[PDB]
Write a protein that binds this DNA or RNA. Structure first.
Ligand SMILES: NC[C@H](Cl)[C@@H](O)c1cnc(N)[nH]1
Ligand SMILES: [Cl-]
Ligand SMILES: [Cl-]
Ligand SMILES: [Cl-]
Ligand SMILES: [Cl-]
Ligand SMILES: [K+]
Ligand SMILES: [Mg+2]
Ligand SMILES: [Mg+2]
Ligand SMILES: [Mg+2]
Ligand SMILES: [Mg+2]
Ligand SMILES: [Mg+2]
Ligand SMILES: [Mg+2]
Ligand SMILES: [Mg+2]
Ligand SMILES: [Mg+2]
Ligand SMILES: [Mg+2]
Ligand SMILES: [Mg+2]
Ligand SMILES: [Mg+2]
Ligand SMILES: [Mg+2]
Ligand SMILES: [Mg+2]
Ligand SMILES: [Mg+2]
Ligand SMILES: [Mg+2]
Ligand SMILES: [Mg+2]
Ligand SMILES: [Mg+2]
Ligand SMILES: [Mg+2]
Ligand SMILES: [Mg+2]
Ligand SMILES: [Mg+2]
Ligand SMILES: [Mg+2]
Ligand SMILES: [Mg+2]
Ligand SMILES: [Mg+2]
Ligand SMILES: [Mg+2]
Ligand SMILES: [Mg+2]
Ligand SMILES: [Mg+2]
Ligand SMILES: [Mg+2]
Ligand SMILES: [Mg+2]
Ligand SMILES: [Mg+2]
Ligand SMILES: [Mg+2]
Ligand SMILES: [Mg+2]
Ligand SMILES: [Mg+2]
Ligand SMILES: [Mg+2]
Ligand SMILES: [Mg+2]
Ligand SMILES: [Mg+2]
Ligand SMILES: [Mg+2]
Ligand SMILES: [Mg+2]
Ligand SMILES: [Mg+2]
Ligand SMILES: [Mg+2]
Ligand SMILES: [Mg+2]
Ligand SMILES: [Mg+2]
Ligand SMILES: [Mg+2]
Ligand SMILES: [Mg+2]
Ligand SMILES: [Mg+2]
Ligand SMILES: [Mg+2]
Ligand SMILES: [Mg+2]
Ligand SMILES: [Mg+2]
Ligand SMILES: [Mg+2]
Ligand SMILES: [Mg+2]
Ligand SMILES: [Mg+2]
Ligand SMILES: [Mg+2]
Ligand SMILES: [Mg+2]
Ligand SMILES: [Mg+2]
Ligand SMILES: [Mg+2]
Ligand SMILES: [Mg+2]
Ligand SMILES: [Mg+2]
Ligand SMILES: [Mg+2]
Ligand SMILES: [Mg+2]
Ligand SMILES: [Mg+2]
Ligand SMILES: [Mg+2]
Ligand SMILES: [Mg+2]
Ligand SMILES: [Mg+2]
Ligand SMILES: [Mg+2]
Ligand SMILES: [Mg+2]
Ligand SMILES: [Mg+2]
Ligand SMILES: [Mg+2]
Ligand SMILES: [Mg+2]
Ligand SMILES: [Mg+2]
Ligand SMILES: [Mg+2]
Ligand SMILES: [Mg+2]
Ligand SMILES: [Mg+2]
Ligand code: NA
Ligand code: NA
Ligand code: NA
Ligand code: NA
Ligand code: NA
Ligand code: NA
Ligand code: NA
Ligand code: NA
Ligand code: NA
Ligand code: NA
Ligand code: NA
Ligand code: NA
Ligand code: NA
Ligand code: NA
Ligand code: NA
Ligand code: NA
Ligand code: NA
Ligand code: NA
Ligand code: NA
Ligand code: NA
Ligand code: NA
Ligand code: NA
Ligand code: NA
Ligand code: NA
Ligand code: NA
Ligand code: NA
Ligand code: NA
Ligand code: NA
Ligand code: NA
Ligand code: NA
Ligand code: NA
Ligand code: NA
Ligand code: NA
Length: 237
RNA sequence: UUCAAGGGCGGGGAGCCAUGUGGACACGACCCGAAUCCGGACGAUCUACGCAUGGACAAGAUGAAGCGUGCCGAAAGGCACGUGGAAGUCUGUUAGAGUUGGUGUCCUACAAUACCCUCUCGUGAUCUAUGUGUAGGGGUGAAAGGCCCAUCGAGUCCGGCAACAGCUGGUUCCAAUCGAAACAUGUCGAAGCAUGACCUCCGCCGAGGUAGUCUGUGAGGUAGAGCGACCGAUUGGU
RNA sequence: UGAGGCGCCCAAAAUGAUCGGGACUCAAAUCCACCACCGAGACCUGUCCGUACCACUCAUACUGGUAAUCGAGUAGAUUGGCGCUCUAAUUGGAUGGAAGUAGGGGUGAAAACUCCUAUGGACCGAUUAGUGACGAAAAUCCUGGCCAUAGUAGCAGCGAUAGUCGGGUGAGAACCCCGACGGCCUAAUGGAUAAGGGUUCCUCAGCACUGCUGAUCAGCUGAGGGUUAGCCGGUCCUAAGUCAUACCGCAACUCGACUAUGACGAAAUGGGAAACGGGUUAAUAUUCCCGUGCCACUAUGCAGUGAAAGUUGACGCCCUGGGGUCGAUCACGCUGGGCAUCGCCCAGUCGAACCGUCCAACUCCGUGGAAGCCGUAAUGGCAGGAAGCGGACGAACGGCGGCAUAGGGAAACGUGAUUCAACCUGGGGCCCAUGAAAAGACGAGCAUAGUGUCCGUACCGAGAACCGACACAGGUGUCCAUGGCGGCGAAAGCCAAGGCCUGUCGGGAGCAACCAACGUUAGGGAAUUCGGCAAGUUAGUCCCGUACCUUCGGAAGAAGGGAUGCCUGCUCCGGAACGGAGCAGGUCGCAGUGACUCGGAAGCUCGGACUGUCUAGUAACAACAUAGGUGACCGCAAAUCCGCAAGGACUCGUACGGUCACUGAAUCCUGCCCAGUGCAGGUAUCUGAACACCUCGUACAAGAGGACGAAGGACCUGUCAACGGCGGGGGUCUUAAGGUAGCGUAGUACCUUGCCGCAUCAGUAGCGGCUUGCAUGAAUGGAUUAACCAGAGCUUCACUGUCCCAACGUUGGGCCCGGUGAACUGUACAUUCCAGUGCGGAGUCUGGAGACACCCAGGGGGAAGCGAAGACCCUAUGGAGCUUUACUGCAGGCUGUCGCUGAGGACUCUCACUCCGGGAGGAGGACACCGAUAGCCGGGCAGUUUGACUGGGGCGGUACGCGCUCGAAAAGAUAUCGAGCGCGCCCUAUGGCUAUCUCAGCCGGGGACCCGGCGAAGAGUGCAAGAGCAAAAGAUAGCUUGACAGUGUUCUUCCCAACGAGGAACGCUGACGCGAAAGCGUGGUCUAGCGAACCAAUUAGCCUGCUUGAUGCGGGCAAUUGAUGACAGAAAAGCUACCCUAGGGAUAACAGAGUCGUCACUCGCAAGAGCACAUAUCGACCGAGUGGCUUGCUACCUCGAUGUCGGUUCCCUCCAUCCUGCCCGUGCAGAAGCGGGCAAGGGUGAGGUUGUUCGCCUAUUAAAGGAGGUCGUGAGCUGGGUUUAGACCGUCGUGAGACAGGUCGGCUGCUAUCUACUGGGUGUGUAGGUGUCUGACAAGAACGACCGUAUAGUACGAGAGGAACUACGGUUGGUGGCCACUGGUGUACCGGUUGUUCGAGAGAGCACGUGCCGGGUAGCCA
């Protein structure tokens, strides 16, 4: 047979890459010596081509000009602060330790100082639940309880652009334009619509998969397709 | 080998070398003949998909939201007219792109995919130039096994290479003698082999031989016949 | 009355009859005898040759002899010889002419040798012994040359049909030049360029080459010449991205990812310092020249201390206002031209870069002070301050002044305006889409001077300069989109400017047939056809008006109805237009969107929701995509994926993510099943590898066992919007459940043209209903559904040459002439036709018939025409792509163990190692990673296998190893998918010996038992069948283990006749059993019951292992057991319609051929019925046949191809006759029939469903017969069906994929050499002429059929009803001819009229070969 589409992807050819050269900024938390004296003013609100959501242009006291993962409720003129003794309001960034429980937070770090990893897409937010000297339980948007280092910095508020998924693309053209700004090959041809040579589900005189769709985790690339290690399938039960 | 017996192999000196020649096996193996498989290279001037930077789309039609004015109403709002100018929107040989029917013309062509009429799209998932990326069990693919320079169910070039075939074709001077087998046994064997039958040639042996007939001593159950002779069929009558 | 001979009836086939033909009758037939002849290479005979043998001989040299008992031959074995090359030895020829070549003479059976003449002009032989790239008719053989083809095809076809008359030059002119007339091109056939080409550019001189003809011309040939830059490009900058170096990897590199650095990366078309005007050359030109201007740098001088913040470069899509130049147009003036019925029409009326100046818009400031005003095309603005007023900043490639008594013009050398490309400047809207960067510039003055190198620059830029082998009808980017009329228009049509007559061969025929494009056709109007394919109809604009349905958008231009020009005078909107909307009156035509441009409309059903995608080159579709729905994986040191590694994509991303899949808009919905399979989770117990550990073993080791036990598995649970399933039976069973909503004869329904209805004259169609559904059904998605569609089917109106049924015309060919000039094809011969024969499909064989030769044109009957080593089918121990629970392996994932790896069966720590963090430092941490190994999963990938037999192959079967009877032809041998049927064991006795004994069955006496008799065998003997057996081979009893060990002979296996294992018969040696003994026992009475090498285990003795001894553990001689049943032994599954190759007519489909069971038809007998009556009519059983249409069988012909079914068109035939003519019978009154005979002249038609043939149906008819010609007819047509590649549905399958199921789409090559015929000529023969005839023969259907009237309301008949002979009139079909008449044509002609151009008028051109409309002569036609 020939290599399946999932294998072509790995090669990182043009068709599969993201238009990085068009992307604006690698939104990461600032590196403050300590103290927390660092603050800045929201100079503008831009569209982030990589996340289909707003990103705030900020200018810091030390001259530094950098874009940022803007949560909802931030506008031009607003003063944002970053540091251990930063104020407890939307747009400000401080370790989960200095953050009062029950307060929605976004752009949470995994390892303190990594710049933020969790909850960064439109509308989402984590949820600081439990405190400690060692751990700070945070409920990620997927609903998982993530035990974290209290030193992990995070931003107060829900990520801006909420509700994006509510309106349907309606037409292929709209999907086309979105897809064109991501690292994804689109449209999608169904495996069952290909030839035996092209995909494990290909072939036949009619369209249906050969074997059952649920594939073992141990399956090799070229075969791992369909329902990957499904714990169950369907809706009933 | 063997208590034993019986068997196997060997034994009363002919070889070695050379030259010519018959035949066998390995090798290209009398010659040509095809689809492969493998290696290293050369191709994205075609084309597929992506990217960068540019360019293109007469004219008309329909008239979304929003806004306005007016009437009605306590309000909510509603109705009318106007404004507005949305759309993978419509008409359109604008440019440009595509390719449905004619199964027309052509079919040693104008052309190794052409001509004419017809037909579809024509502000978008649009078309297009140039630059640029992806390379061969690998790309690319809105998927047809499509496309990757007239080459694709695995490109092209050279090499491995004089690939192998039990399959088709061909294998060049004269004469004299003998003269088949198209069968048997085994065979992944039945389009092939080996071993026999049969053809030929050579050396050896040394007096018989037997294609015909008659007679003698034997073998035999086919034709025919018959079945109160077995066997099994198969009519009727007192 | 019996028998015999010969004949007769029975007796039907397709191009032209036959005994080979003629033809034959007291035979030239037949039968019985006879006589004589002809007739082979046989037989006889003369001579010769070869071969064999004999005598003589050294001899195979001579000579003599023998052959009645020698003389054919494919494959093949054997042997003597001819010829070629070069070597050697011996020996010769040649300039007094070698070799070769051409023609000719002689020898040899022959290969071949040799001579003569001519040519040639320098080499050439012989004998012997050697040598070898040593002998050709063939291979779709190779290379070269050449003939026919043939003076043939092409040099016509394209919406660009282009020329003509004069003249010039010249040896020569249709096409080279000049003038005129006439045309063509308008986003191109014009102008400027990119790539690419590369000198093609210009000049001179030429024509051997090239140029579709010619050429004096040329992109050709030769020689010269030609490209000038500070201000156009490059150059510089950076883009997607590329490379180089370092680092790292790799066995290694010219390899490889990341991270650094550097460099590269844009000539039309990214960014960017600066040039305009005129002039000039044969050829350059923002480059040269004249004039004027500008930029950068540097130097000097003055100014300036500012100088880096910021601005710029610098940016998406849609709508839109304002500013505004060119252009165009309008008014008017001037200059020049044109026209001449008028007073119109055309051209010009010029003038840059640059310098200076002006400024709308936006932004802002002051003033002011709106509580409702301001403002816009629109949105909008405001007490947070609206209008107004003043002001700051601030635009054009624009205005204005200079530039400029510069330039340019023959001259005048204008002025206003409107609409306004360019250019400038604003406002609004959209994004699940956010629309480069860097260099540079600005910021930041002025004078004067100096410098400004290097590379490109010609020309083409395309129906001749590029790519496509070509001067190729193809392909190929940019700018000119503002030239006039027209009109909505960058549309058509017409015309400027500019270009061209080079989409480059001509001349001639009223110019025939035929073909390509096309115009028009009366009446009818889809009757055509698979199907309205093709064509046609409709059309522009305004007014009125508009259904079902609908997702409320749409449907919709629904449909339907009306209007439409010109002229005169006006109104309204607007600032106005040379803008738009209307009014009144007048008025012409057949026609006013007058041409051109320019929808045909309506309805039902199927499918996919829609726009979109696709098989470059037969599929555009229902297929892919899509939004939408759904499930799965993953918290990022992730899931998924790429790399060998170093590393990488996703990712400048983070669950509202992105990966992996299914379904495929909206709406209503989406049932039941977890047994199998998959995936996932759990798990007491069971199973589960290696290391380590324990035991045995070994002075060690191999090795054997044990304990512990991971993932995995067993087991359990979860899960179907996972793969998939949703029946049989009865009022449960397989295997989990047992089909719910819906839909249903479906693109799924075999039966099937289902039934009913609608519709039609008629409807395998279509729609609706029913529906038991061969074999519908829910995200393998079910149902429904508006809109959409080059998608499939059907209906109606309209339309029409699709048809009835064809005609005429137009243009280009075609035909003739000049010039140019191929190809395909060719074993040979060839004037054939009818029959026959033959490998069964002959121009060539056989018999006849016909046939004088050559040539022109034609349409293609035949050469199983030409073209392609058949795609179909089978075969090959062929190939490839694909699949899987085929075989074997390889990646990869999971898991244990070892190493890295450290301190203190569960736990702490830090110090390696990893990651985060700039770092301090944090997280993690002996784990992870990495290296190694083990177990599991593992078509992700690789190599392969997947047998043979066979009335082809497959399915089935096994005639694949064995035994018996028969087949089998009285020895032996003997085939078939031949007939009957068996064996793959069983038995410790069912073996062995001995003793005693005789059985089946029947009878008689007291189905057990006892007694007698008859009883050669029918019993019994393990199991087929055949055979053997009676004091036994059977029965009973007793005893016994010979079913023993060893080694042979012979036969068999395998006749003859080689071959293994196996088997048997018969010995010997040893040991035994039984018997008095002879003797019997080498298993079972005989013929079936069986298996090699390698390896293991097993039995007993011995041989043996590398200097040597001991021990362990090995190697071996002999034999037993373990299986290969495909049974003389491989370890082994499938699909291909995506296919590929080698071959086969060794083998299937189609056609032919044989057969004829089948089928069609007939006959013999005649039961029976027909009210009686076999035979008017019907007709069984049985029996005998004919045909070659069906079907089947066979495997002869072709696989280096004989093109399919159906249809069509055109021709001939058969008769078994449907009609028509003439007859016979009748259950014949008549009329109408029924049955039969002769008879093939003619006729046998039109339509509805269906691809159909067939068949069903309708209405007409005299009747609407059947069949043959390769199931006649594809070098004739068509292409609906079968049967390629795409796709769907049902069924089947794990799957690829399949189907003798359905469905949508899906290509039709060739220039005719021969032959054949239709027609036309030229010659020869008969043997200079003119005119007229004859008639051997040949062709015809030239005529076939019907209706009507009189006969006649007659004959006949109760009546109803109702004939004929004959005579007439017409119709239909066929045929031949003709055009007065009717009709068509009529691009002859005349008129009307639209647009445009020539100024108007007059008169004309174009609008495709007439713009359109109306009329239409001749001719040709129906
Ligand atoms: N294939 C098995 C062989 Cl032929 C075996 O039977 C045998 C017999 N003789 C042999 N030499 N080999
Ligand atoms: Cl998305
Ligand atoms: Cl000889
Ligand atoms: Cl240039
Ligand atoms: Cl505005
Ligand atoms: K064939
Ligand atoms: Mg990031
Ligand atoms: Mg992309
Ligand atoms: Mg899809
Ligand atoms: Mg497919
Ligand atoms: Mg596969
Ligand atoms: Mg499907
Ligand atoms: Mg499916
Ligand atoms: Mg390219
Ligand atoms: Mg409007
Ligand atoms: Mg559109
Ligand atoms: Mg259109
Ligand atoms: Mg490109
Ligand atoms: Mg396919
Ligand atoms: Mg010979
Ligand atoms: Mg001889
Ligand atoms: Mg007999
Ligand atoms: Mg002979
Ligand atoms: Mg000599
Ligand atoms: Mg030969
Ligand atoms: Mg010819
Ligand atoms: Mg013309
Ligand atoms: Mg030159
Ligand atoms: Mg020239
Ligand atoms: Mg000249
Ligand atoms: Mg550069
Ligand atoms: Mg540029
Ligand atoms: Mg020039
Ligand atoms: Mg030039
Ligand atoms: Mg030309
Ligand atoms: Mg007509
Ligand atoms: Mg019809
Ligand atoms: Mg018909
Ligand atoms: Mg049509
Ligand atoms: Mg007005
Ligand atoms: Mg249907
Ligand atoms: Mg569609
Ligand atoms: Mg195609
Ligand atoms: Mg299409
Ligand atoms: Mg097509
Ligand atoms: Mg689909
Ligand atoms: Mg989806
Ligand atoms: Mg989805
Ligand atoms: Mg029906
Ligand atoms: Mg379901
Ligand atoms: Mg072949
Ligand atoms: Mg096949
Ligand atoms: Mg294969
Ligand atoms: Mg790191
Ligand atoms: Mg495989
Ligand atoms: Mg191999
Ligand atoms: Mg076979
Ligand atoms: Mg015998
Ligand atoms: Mg015996
Ligand atoms: Mg073995
Ligand atoms: Mg054993
Ligand atoms: Mg065998
Ligand atoms: Mg055998
Ligand atoms: Mg083949
Ligand atoms: Mg045959
Ligand atoms: Mg033929
Ligand atoms: Mg007759
Ligand atoms: Mg006749
Ligand atoms: Mg036929
Ligand atoms: Mg016929
Ligand atoms: Mg034919
Ligand atoms: Mg044909
Ligand atoms: Mg032809
Ligand atoms: Mg067809
Ligand atoms: Mg069809
Ligand atoms: Mg079809
Ligand atoms: Mg004309
Ligand atoms: Na499939
Ligand atoms: Na191979
Ligand atoms: Na390319
Ligand atoms: Na509105
Ligand atoms: Na076309
Ligand atoms: Na390859
Ligand atoms: Na090779
Ligand atoms: Na081979
Ligand atoms: Na044979
Ligand atoms: Na054989
Ligand atoms: Na063979
Ligand atoms: Na004798
Ligand atoms: Na007999
Ligand atoms: Na011979
Ligand atoms: Na105009
Ligand atoms: Na010419
Ligand atoms: Na569209
Ligand atoms: Na289950
Ligand atoms: Na299950
Ligand atoms: Na089902
Ligand atoms: Na479409
Ligand atoms: Na016509
Ligand atoms: Na012909
Ligand atoms: Na293949
Ligand atoms: Na096999
Ligand atoms: Na034997
Ligand atoms: Na017959
Ligand atoms: Na042939
Ligand atoms: Na036909
Ligand atoms: Na007749
Ligand atoms: Na035929
Ligand atoms: Na046909
Ligand atoms: Na054809």
């Amino acid at each position: 047979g020939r290599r399946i589409q999932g294998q072509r992807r790995g090669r990182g050819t043009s068709t599969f890459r993201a238009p990085s050269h068009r992307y604006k900024a690698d939104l990461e938390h600032r590196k403050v010596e300590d103290g927390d004296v660092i603050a800045g003013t929201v100079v503008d609100i831009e569209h982030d081509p990589a996340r289909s959501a707003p990103v705030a242009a900020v200018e810091f006291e030390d001259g530094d000009r950098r874009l940022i993962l803007a949560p909802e409720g931030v506008g031009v003129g607003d003063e944002l602060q970053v540091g251990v003794s930063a104020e407890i309001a939307p747009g400000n960034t401080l370790p989960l330790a200095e953050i009062p429980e029950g307060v929605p937070v976004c752009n949470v770090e995994s390892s303190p100082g990594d710049g933020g990893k969790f909850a960064r897409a439109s509308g989402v937010n984590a949820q600081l639940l439990t405190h400690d000297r060692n751990v700070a339980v945070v409920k990620l948007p997927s609903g998982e309880m993530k035990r974290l280092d209290p030193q992990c910095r995070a931003t107060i508020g829900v990520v801006a652009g909420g509700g994006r998924t509510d309106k349907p693309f309606v037409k292929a053209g709209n999907k086309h334009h979105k897809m064109k700004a991501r690292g994804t090959k689109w449209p999608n041809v169904r495996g069952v619509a290909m030839n035996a040579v092209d995909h494990p589900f290909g072939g036949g005189g009619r369209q249906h998969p050969g074997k059952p769709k649920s594939i073992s985790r141990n399956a090799p690339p070229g075969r791992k397709v369909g329902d990957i290690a499904s714990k169950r399938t369907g809706r009933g039960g």
